[PDB]
Amino acid sequence: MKASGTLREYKVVGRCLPTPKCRTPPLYRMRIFAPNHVVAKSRFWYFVSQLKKMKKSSGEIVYCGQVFEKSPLRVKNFGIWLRYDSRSGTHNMYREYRDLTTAGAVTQCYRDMGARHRARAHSIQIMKVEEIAASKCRRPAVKQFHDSKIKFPLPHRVLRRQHKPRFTTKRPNTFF
Amino acid sequence: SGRLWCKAIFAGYKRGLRNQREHTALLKIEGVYARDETEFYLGKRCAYVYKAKNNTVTPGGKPNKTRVIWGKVTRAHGNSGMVRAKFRSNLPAKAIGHRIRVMLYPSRI
Amino acid sequence: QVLVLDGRGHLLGRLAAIVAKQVLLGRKVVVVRCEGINISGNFYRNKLKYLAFLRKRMNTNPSRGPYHFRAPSRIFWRTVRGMLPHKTKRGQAALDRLKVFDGIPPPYDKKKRMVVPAALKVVRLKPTRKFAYLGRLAHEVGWKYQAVTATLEEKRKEKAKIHYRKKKQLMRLRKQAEKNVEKKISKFTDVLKTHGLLV
Amino acid sequence: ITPGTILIILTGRHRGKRVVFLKQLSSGLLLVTGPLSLNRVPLRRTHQKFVIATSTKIDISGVKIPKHLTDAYFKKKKLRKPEKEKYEITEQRKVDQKAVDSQILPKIKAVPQLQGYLRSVFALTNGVYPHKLVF
Amino acid sequence: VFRRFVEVGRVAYVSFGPHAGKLVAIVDVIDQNRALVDGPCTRVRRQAMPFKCMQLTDFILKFPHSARQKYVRKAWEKADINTKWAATRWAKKIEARERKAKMTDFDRYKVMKAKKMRNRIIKNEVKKLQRAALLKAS
Amino acid sequence: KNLRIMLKLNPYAKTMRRNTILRQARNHKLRVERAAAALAAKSD
RNA sequence: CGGAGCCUCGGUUGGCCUCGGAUAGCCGGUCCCCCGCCGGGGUCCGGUGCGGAGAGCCCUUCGUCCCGGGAAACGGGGCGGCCGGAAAGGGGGCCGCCCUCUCGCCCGUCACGCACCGCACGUUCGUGGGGAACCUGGCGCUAAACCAUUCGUAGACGACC
RNA sequence: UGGAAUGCGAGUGCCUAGUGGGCCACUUUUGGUAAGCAGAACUGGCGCUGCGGGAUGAACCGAACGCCGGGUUAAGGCGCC
RNA sequence: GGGCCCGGGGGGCCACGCGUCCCCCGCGAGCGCACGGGGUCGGCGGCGAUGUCGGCUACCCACCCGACCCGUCUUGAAAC
Ligand SMILES: [Mg+2]
Ligand SMILES: [Mg+2]
Ligand SMILES: [Mg+2]
Ligand SMILES: [Mg+2]
Ligand SMILES: [Mg+2]
Ligand SMILES: [Mg+2]
Ligand SMILES: [Mg+2]
Ligand SMILES: [Mg+2]
Ligand SMILES: [Mg+2]
Ligand SMILES: [Mg+2]
Ligand SMILES: [Mg+2]
Ligand SMILES: [Mg+2]
Ligand SMILES: [Mg+2]
Ligand SMILES: [Mg+2]
């Protein structure tokens, strides 16, 4: 899987193909984060196969649909439990993020895992994603934004319109 | 009286890195530094204007040393406002870095 | 006609990249105060870079090149030459469209200087990063006219200060004059404000 | 391009001049007038692709353009040579110019600084870029 | 040295993006780069916005962090940020910028004539003020 | 792209296109009237 | 120093005549206060998504006629003198004149100009650079280099003294 | 009811040149410390083959070639060259 | 929902002769416009006898991109 663009959260439900032994095999559900639904079903079959004696040939997808963020206008803290392969082992991490959507938080995890650990998306398994209250967060990067009277300036604002104009008479001012 | 044409530069021919298509010229137009601003200049006439030793007939005038190769803007090139132009004859390589007149006709405004 | 640039507070390679593309399109460029140009990284690791360049020489005849120019202007010039196809007539024509100066000699001392915000150090570097000064680096690899250029640059700044005070004087009169003739020019002041020229 | 619109001619000896658009002839060419007394552009045909239509408009809805002013009216007549043959302004054209001008000219003078605007020529200058400016 | 702070209620001008030219209020801070903003009286839905596309103004509305859009609008109307904004030189300079941009060819002609005459009158007066200052020197 | 070429291959296409045009114009006329009423309702 | 032209070479198609700089800070007024050979610091007051803004400024060209209203009258155009500039030096400003105009700008009045009958290389910088000549006036100049000879502080020959 | 899908016109006979030094890569693999070493399997290449990309390069990556115009791409790229 | 969108009590149909038997209950005329078996104008302008018009290619020159010297043996040649 390529963690392309902003991921979506998919609810994938699958089961073993019914057989005379078991005419109604049990139903399984997973939370999948993927770029599109085609990738979402593919990853499902990759995960259930690791937990059950099942695979695409001997099973079917019963429901694939996007789970929509339920409070897209409310800031939340997300705890993420993931495992990943490094160059020389596997590890379990717990990570935290602040975001408005749970799929946005998961995307941050992939970019972050790529930035800080050079971990490609194909080597990352998001085990669990929870919304966490400010009092249960652990990472100081997230906790410093739990301040009702938070304030801070924007020092040294760099000129981003550096080629409009490309040549000017006045030098830029970085203080605002 | 005054100028009635926009100022352009003959930046170079159409090319990859090691192949050159001389039938298309890349033009840089003064003040046009993005692709969304090139829309005004599509289809407008272009003139490489120069002087030679021998006299030649001037439409509406008497023979002089001025000569012109006509062309027109055909499409935008890139993201920063370069346009592709085509002329009745491939531009001479000595024209690279020199003025190309871009006329205000055919008017669409 | 001529694009005059001020090299103070510009990073060496970003200025060269823009300048090289400009003279290849047929524009004349003058860069003054090449000793005021900057390079990212601590001074020491940039001095080692030029000393490594200084060691490059034809083992059988050093006089045949490379030629290691020591002036901050010539260092910049060679850097723009490295971004041009200078072994072809088209590149050499462009290279002749560029003049480089230490200090600001006439006539550019009495002309307005433009900058390139895409090459300015205040824009392109993080403020905590170290950087080198082209003039100091040049002075410590054999450049001989650092002390003189500074001496003449201080004379120019003294004269430019008197010129600025004269211009501020002529601007204070300009503002006063607009009050004296406010009645007579009020109508023409409404046209300009109606169309955004005056706020 | 609506009747009464001011157009900037882009070609011919009258290039850069600002003229008043009267009507579109059956051939599709436009009919315009300077008027003559303002910029020495007479009743003359012009092609629309070669004019810039400004946003300035006078109301010439009450102007009665003579009906004989047609494509055949403005078509060039051939002149023969064996030295040179010179074009002459027929007395009818002068009469037609005055009849149309006498109705447009008073309406131009109704708008302040418009007659002077029509006397002045269009040109591009330093820093002025056609794609940026409104006409 | 800092005078404008990213805080709850700060009104920020949006310089570029899909909402360029509008005013929004900082409702909450997500992380170092993003904030929850709201434009109830300026046609902006509550959403995340980076600080990069924001320019802080001098107004600071008083509502609790993450209060719903009803109370952001209520504070906006009490402070009359819309009319106060239009009275600032910052807003006026924006207005002048767009007035000049839309100038028609005829408008540009009339400005040239007005500017032509206005500049001559000022120059003549400056000449007289210079000559008058000369006599005091003598 | 060419209408009369389509009708040579599928004459019914003319019926479908005429119906679409009439339906779409009719649905637009409702939305404006709905919107116009709402705006008038707000003015009250 | 002060006429017609003829070749040839090209490009270009308004100008910006200048503080120094800072960037976790800036810019302009303010001399009332303190220093100095009119300049610096303080105070105070203004601006600061720079508007005393290069996102800018200046100039703007269809021409002429007649007569009005604003603007000028300390004004426009034109021969003599003194400061002044050296990093690669100023056809800027100032003072005299005997002259030369009430027009230069803005808003109007009034007409006229090849109005060449829709059409390109138009419009400058342009008395442009270089070359032969032809005139036509004034004021000025009347040299050296190399060879040859000689030298031997030099020398394969050239070169060099 | 020409008895699975899909695609495609097939069968057959004479005469016949050059070749019978190869070499390279993914994977498998023998000897060897290893070798741009020697020796095998499979497929694909280079040899016989230009062209875009890998600065440069037999074999890598893309793609295979009549003489052209327009459009769009692959692999690769987009500070300047 | 499906049944020529089953049966009964404002808007589009590639319905539109009839004698009937009854399931059920073989040729109208003209005229015209065209998104219709691949472009035409029943549209125009300038210039021309001593200095100008056209002349691909060819002679010379310039510039931009490309470009290693052929034959040969060879797995491999621009090959030191
Ligand atoms: Mg010319
Ligand atoms: Mg030395
Ligand atoms: Mg082997
Ligand atoms: Mg062989
Ligand atoms: Mg083969
Ligand atoms: Mg091949
Ligand atoms: Mg390589
Ligand atoms: Mg092609
Ligand atoms: Mg490259
Ligand atoms: Mg090459
Ligand atoms: Mg051989
Ligand atoms: Mg061999
Ligand atoms: Mg060979
Ligand atoms: Mg070799």
* CA–CA dist B81, B67 (Å, integer): 28
Closest nucleotide to B96, Cα to C1'? I64
- Between CA C192 and CA D11, with CA D118 as vertex, the angle to 5 degrees is 115
In this complex, whether A and F touch, counting 3 or more CB pairs under 8 angstroms, is: no
Cis geometry, peptide bond prior to residue A165 (ω within 30 degrees of 0): yes
Using DSSP's 3-state secondary structure scheme, residue C99 falls into strand
Beta carbons within 10 angstroms of residue A125's beta carbon: 15
* CA–CA dist F35, F27 (Å, integer): 12
* CA–CA dist C178, E119 (Å, integer): 10
Question: Residue with structure tokens 């100038």?
Answer: E103
**Residue E127 sits at the chain C interface (C-beta within 8 Å):** no
Closest CA to C17 of C80, C101, C107, C94: C80
> Would the Cβ of F41 be found within 7 angstroms of any atom in strand I?
no
C40: enclosing H helix or E strand = strand C38-40
Which residues, by CB, come closer than 7 Å to strand H?
A: B 16-19, 21, 23-24, 74-75, 84, 86; C 13, 16-18, 20-21, 24, 83-85, 91
Closest nucleotide to D113, Cα to C1'? G107
Question: Residue with structure tokens 């409310």?
Answer: A74
Report, in ranges, which bases of strand G sit under 7 Å from a protein C-beta: 8-26, 28-30, 38-39, 47-63, 70-76, 86-90, 105-124
E58-82: string of b/e by CB count within 10 Å (b at 16+)? ebbbebebebeeebbbebbeebebe
CA distances from C61 to C52, C54, C69, C142, D94 (A): 18, 15, 17, 21, 88
Inspect the interface and report whether the beta carbons of C192 and E95 lie closer than 8 Å.
no
Report, in ranges, which bases of strand I sit under 7 Å from a protein C-beta: 12-14, 34-37, 43-47, 51-54, 62-67
Chain A residues close to C114, C-beta within 8 Å: 167-169
Inspect the interface and report whether the beta carbons of A151 and E2 lie closer than 8 Å.
no
Inspect the interface and report whether the beta carbons of E55 and A149 lie closer than 8 Å.
no
**Residue E51 sits at the chain A interface (C-beta within 8 Å):** yes
**Residue E106 sits at the chain D interface (C-beta within 8 Å):** yes
Please name the residues in contact with D87: beta carbons below 8 A apart, sequence gap of 6 or more.
D79
D120 to chain B: closest CA residue: B1
Indicate the residue type of D73: Y
CA atoms within 13 A on the CB side of A148: 4
* CA–CA dist A59, A53 (Å, integer): 10
Gap from A160 CA to H25 C1', in Å?
A: 48
C5-14: string of b/e by CB count within 10 Å (b at 16+)? bbbbbbbbbb
Inspect the interface and report whether the beta carbons of E104 and D56 lie closer than 8 Å.
yes
Tokens of C167: 């211009």
Dihedral over Cα of E46, E50, E56, E57: its sign? negative
Chain C residues close to E110, C-beta within 8 Å: 191
Q: For residues A45 and A39, is the Cβ–Cβ distance under 8 A?
A: no
CA atoms within 13 A on the CB side of B39: 5
In this complex, whether E and A touch, counting 3 or more CB pairs under 8 angstroms, is: yes
Per-residue DSSP letters for B4-34? -EEEEEEEEEEE-SS-EEEEEEEEEETT--S
A36 DSSP assignment: S
Q: What are the φ/ψ torsions at residue E84 (nearest 5 degrees)?
A: -65, -40
| Span from the CA of B95 to the centroid of ligand 2 (angstroms) | 43
Gap from C167 CA to H10 C1', in Å?
A: 100
Tokens of D117: 């605007």
Question: Residue with structure tokens 């399109």?
Answer: C25
Per-residue DSSP letters for E45-59? EEEEEESTTEEEEEE
Residue of B96, B98, B99, B100 to mutate for C, most C C-beta atoms under 10 A? B96
Determination method here?
Answer: cryo-EM
Chain A residues close to E31, C-beta within 8 Å: 98, 145
Q: Cite the beta strand spans of E10-109 per DSSP E.
A: 10-14, 23-29, 34-39, 44-50, 54-60
Indicate the residue type of D118: L
Indicate the residue type of C176: Q
